[PDB]
Design a protein around this ligand. Structure first.
Ligand SMILES: [Mg+2]
Ligand SMILES: [Mg+2]
Ligand SMILES: [Mg+2]
Ligand SMILES: [Mg+2]
Ligand SMILES: [Mg+2]
Ligand SMILES: [Mg+2]
Ligand SMILES: [Mg+2]
Ligand SMILES: [Mg+2]
Ligand SMILES: [Mg+2]
Ligand SMILES: [Mg+2]
Ligand SMILES: [Mg+2]
Ligand SMILES: [Mg+2]
Ligand SMILES: [Mg+2]
Ligand SMILES: [Mg+2]
Ligand SMILES: [Mg+2]
Lengths: 88, 100, 56, 271, 129, 65
RNA sequence: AAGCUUGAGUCUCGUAGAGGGGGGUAGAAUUCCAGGUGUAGCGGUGAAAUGCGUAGAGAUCUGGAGGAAUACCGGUGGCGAAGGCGGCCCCCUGGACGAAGACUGACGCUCAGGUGCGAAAGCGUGGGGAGCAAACAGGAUUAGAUACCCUGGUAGUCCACGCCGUAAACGAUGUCGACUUGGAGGUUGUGCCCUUGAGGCGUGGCUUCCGGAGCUAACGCGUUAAGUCGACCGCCUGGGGA
């Protein structure tokens, strides 16, 4: 699924002064990474429907978070997408 | 690197040939720098029901902590080698070291 | 239920033992169940009924 | 994969294109290529021998290796190519010493796959080995009947032959038709299925395609005159005569196996 | 969602009245506190007290005079789905005066009667009897 | 009465033949948790162990074969 | 404009699970193929007949070949949004739930349209085909028997990638959030107190039955409401026609 060490690394990359662990941006990044990981699986296992629903839910959550960020402050939102490679 | 409990059955006449086989297996796991936890040979044991025609089988137990690749290789070997009849590959959790 | 006859033991007693073993197994009941195919739904309903009966 | 064409012309309507994008576009390998002269269903006596043959695009021969005599050497796939000679696809394989060979394409094979011919070869689709080393049960293509003779069984696209019995010198192979037959365990056989399963899903679409394929039109006996074919004649449509060849041999069940040689090796006929 | 707090509070109060609870505890607000104070003034309840810094909890002590609940009927007219705003002369008289209405009056939240006396209208929150 | 709970073990292993044979009948059929008095997860574990044994042909599927 | 944690989230350890998808494999049993032993019937029903069987069936032992489903465990057991999902084992993976804690700070709820999932049967190419079994055939039964019953038996049931998009898809109870005397339990965890022993203290999540307040047309539901409120939708407005 997603490694503890990997999560820690992500936190280090994104969260402010590493003390933060539940940052919105961080969460979004985590979601994205797992989607990317799972994309190959999805391509391979085309009929895996329950699993698909999970990631759909995750995707939705990510979208919501992005929306929240957007009107809160745009610049940071933009920055986050820049390093991520998220389209809009 | 994941914990792997493997117990396999060997042909009754191929009990003499398995020490070498055991050593080969050991080498294989050492190749990928995996861990060997325990090894217990129950020897020639009379089966509860006969498989094909053989009534007695050579039982071998082994606990591993290795990557997927070597496990896959082991499986392939098992599929190929008719001396080792069947194996029970299994996932385990934490350090399992003690037999009997 | 493979049953063997002991020395210093009557035939009737052996028969009785065999019967007991059979009862323990529930082979006849299983056969009855499998005699005709049961729809899963029907089986579930039966189970529910049994559960209801259990409550007294 | 399978491409259903948009029905622009009435010709292009039903055409189902079997498209493998993995295939190499351009020139086939030169020294492994030879002349394929079309005969048009005619023999030495110049007479039509087998009807409804001849025409279409000029074909070039591929010396596809079915013997596989280079034992103990790994072979890596250079590039997968098209073959007009057979329904199956062909792969050009680079050798570690330095050789190209045309081999029949396996199912689980792309560009850059390592295979091996010989006794010491391990389990992998594309590996060629004698049946006395093989585990019984698996699906096999490119199969020899006699030792060192050359692969003769399962060379059409997508085909495979399962192994059913092991009896020392002989091994029973359950064929694609279902006819179980005993083959000697010393003969070479290539593990896996043929690498064009989707070939059967192809629709030619039009008479033109058939003609290209090299197949002339087929006149129904019932249409022919009573001189030309047994099913001939009749005012309007008439048939009141049991279905036979152009030569008057029943063609609705009349079994014609009279080999009498290899019939000992045959275990059980097809269903 | 936790959409209406006032309504929730009212519901809690009703439940307490039904089940004969001595004290009802609930999440607190300033407007809520004001409402409670108003209720106390009117004479429906014994005493109210808010306690909590991060999570404020309003505790309400209920009366059961002569073996029966004092707050007989307590229902919102103004709602999150539909808000009711009333003019000064348009203000209701709940159960012919014998019973009251909680009104969001612009000069402090209070009784309908009080609002009338003042000369000011607004949003009619709840109907209390 | 559950013995496993009394013992205080993490996993019921297919190695111990003596414990597993007490929880199946002579013919080769598993005894319920309602008769033995076992916890449900533990029962499941036991069943799994039995299955494993059967696979390995340690304890039989059927006593006549 | 500026802030808060309880709502809603994410992180640390775990928790069990028929949660999926993909790949392997185990057993029994049926069918069939082959052979060995064997002889007069077998099979079926309420009773019979069709059937199968003097060619040797059924019976039965051995050897196989296969296709499918997983006895026993298995329990108003569990998990899933539902549809559903039960041999076992691996790979990929979703989610739930919890415990201490850490952090984000309303990120919440519902949802017209919209999108995805959606038992069965069916449909589509390709497979696969043991049983079962529409249709179909014969026998019965029958006043008749297009049925119920028997012997048989194709599609289908099984996979592969698609379509279909309906079920009494039913807890006949929309979804979420809040509150209100209880019990018997079961299930699934977990933290303290000397666990002085399976256990004790309580104390959180999950599901089943009885039932108080209440409610309703009653039946009944009943802290998982059909109760007391709020949000939001969806839908009804006599039956038939439809
Ligand atoms: Mg022709
Ligand atoms: Mg034609
Ligand atoms: Mg003519
Ligand atoms: Mg003629
Ligand atoms: Mg005519
Ligand atoms: Mg005629
Ligand atoms: Mg803040
Ligand atoms: Mg279906
Ligand atoms: Mg179909
Ligand atoms: Mg029938
Ligand atoms: Mg009939
Ligand atoms: Mg409907
Ligand atoms: Mg249902
Ligand atoms: Mg409905
Ligand atoms: Mg009740």
């Amino acid at each position: 699924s997603l490694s503890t060490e990997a999560t820690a690394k992500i936190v280090s990359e994104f969260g402010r002064d590493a003390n933060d662990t539940g940052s919105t941006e961080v969460q979004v990044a985590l979601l994205t990474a797992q989607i990317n990981h799972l994309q190959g699986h999805f391509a391979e296992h085309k009929k895996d429907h329950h699993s698909r629903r999970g990631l759909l839910r995750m995707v939705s959550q990510r979208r919501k978070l992005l929306d929240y960020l957007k009107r809160k402050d745009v610049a940071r939102y933009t920055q986050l997408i820049e390093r991520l490679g998220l389209r809009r | 690197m994941r914990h792997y409990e493997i117990v396999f059955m060997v042909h009754p006449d191929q009990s003499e040939q398995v020490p070498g086989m055991i050593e080969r297996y050991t080498a294989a796991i050492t190749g990928a720098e995996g861990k060997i936890h325990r090894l217990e040979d129950w020897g020639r044991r009379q089966l509860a029901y006969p498989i094909n025609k053989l009534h007695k089988a050579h039982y071998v137990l082994m606990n591993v902590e290795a990557p997927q690749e070597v496990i896959d290789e082991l499986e392939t070997t098992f599929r190929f080698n008719d001396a080792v009849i069947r194996s029970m590959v299994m996932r385990t959790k934490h350090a399992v070291t003690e037999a009997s | 239920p493979v049953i063997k006859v002991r020395e210093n033991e009557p035939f009737d007693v052996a028969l009785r033992r065999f019967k007991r073993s059979c009862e323990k197994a529930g082979v006849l009941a299983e056969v009855r169940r499998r005699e005709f195919y049961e729809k899963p739904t029907t089986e579930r309903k039966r189970a529910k009924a049994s559960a209801v009966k259990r409550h007294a | 994969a399978v491409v259903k064409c948009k029905p622009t012309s009435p010709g292009r309507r039903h055409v189902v294109k079997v498209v493998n994008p993995e295939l190499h576009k351009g020139k086939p390998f030169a020294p492994l290529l030879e002349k394929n002269s079309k005969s048009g269903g005619r023999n030495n006596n110049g007479r039509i021998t087998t009807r409804h043959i001849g025409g279409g695009h000029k074909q070039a021969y591929r010396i596809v290796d079915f013997k596989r005599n280079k034992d103990g050497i790994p072979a890596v796939v250079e590039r997968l190519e098209y073959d007009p000679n057979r329904s199956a696809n062909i792969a050009l394989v680079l050798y570690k010493d330095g050789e190209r060979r045309y081999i029949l394409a396996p199912k689980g094979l792309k560009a850059g796959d390592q295979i091996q011919s010989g006794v010491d070869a391990a389990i992998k689709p594309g590996n060629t080995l004698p049946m006395r080393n093989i585990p019984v049960g698996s699906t096999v293509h490119n199969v020899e009947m006699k030792p060192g003779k050359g692969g003769q069984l399962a060379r059409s696209a997508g085909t495979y032959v399962q192994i059913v019995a092991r009896d020392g010198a002989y091994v029973t192979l359950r064929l694609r038709s279902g006819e179980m037959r005993k083959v000697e365990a010393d003969c070479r056989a290539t593990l896996g299925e043929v690498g064009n399963a989707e070939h059967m899903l192809r629709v030619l679409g039009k008479a033109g395609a058939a003609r290209w394929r090299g197949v002339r039109p087929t006149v129904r006996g019932t249409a022919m005159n009573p001189v030309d074919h047994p099913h001939g004649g009749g005012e309007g449509r008439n048939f009141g005569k049991h279905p036979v060849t152009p030569w008057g041999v029943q063609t609705k069940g009349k079994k014609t196996r009279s080999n009498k040689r290899t019939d000992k090796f045959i275990v059980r006929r097809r269903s | 969602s936790m959409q209406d707090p006032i309504a929730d509070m009212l519901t809690r109060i009703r439940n307490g009245q039904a089940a004969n609870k001595a004290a009802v505890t609930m999440p607190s607000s300033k407007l809520k506190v004001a409402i409670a104070n108003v209720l106390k003034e009117e004479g429906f309840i014994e005493d109210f007290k808010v306690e909590g810094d991060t999570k404020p909890e309003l505790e309400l002590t209920l009366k059961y005079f002569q073996g029966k609940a004092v707050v007989e009927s307590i229902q919102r007219v103004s709602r999150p789905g539909l808000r009711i705003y009333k003019r000064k002369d348009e203000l209701p008289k709940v159960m012919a005066g014998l019973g009251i209405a909680v009104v969001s009056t612009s000069k402090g939240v209070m009784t309908d009667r009080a609002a009338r006396q003042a000369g000011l209208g607004g949003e009619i929150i709840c109907y209390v009897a | 009465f559950c013995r496993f709970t009394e013992e205080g073990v993490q996993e019921i292993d297919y190695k111990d033949i003596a414990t597993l044979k007490n929880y199946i009948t002579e013919s080769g059929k598993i005894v319920p948790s309602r008769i033995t008095g076992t916890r449900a997860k533990y029962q499941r574990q036991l069943a799994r162990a039995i299955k494993r044994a059967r696979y390995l042909s340690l304890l039989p599927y059927t006593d006549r074969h």
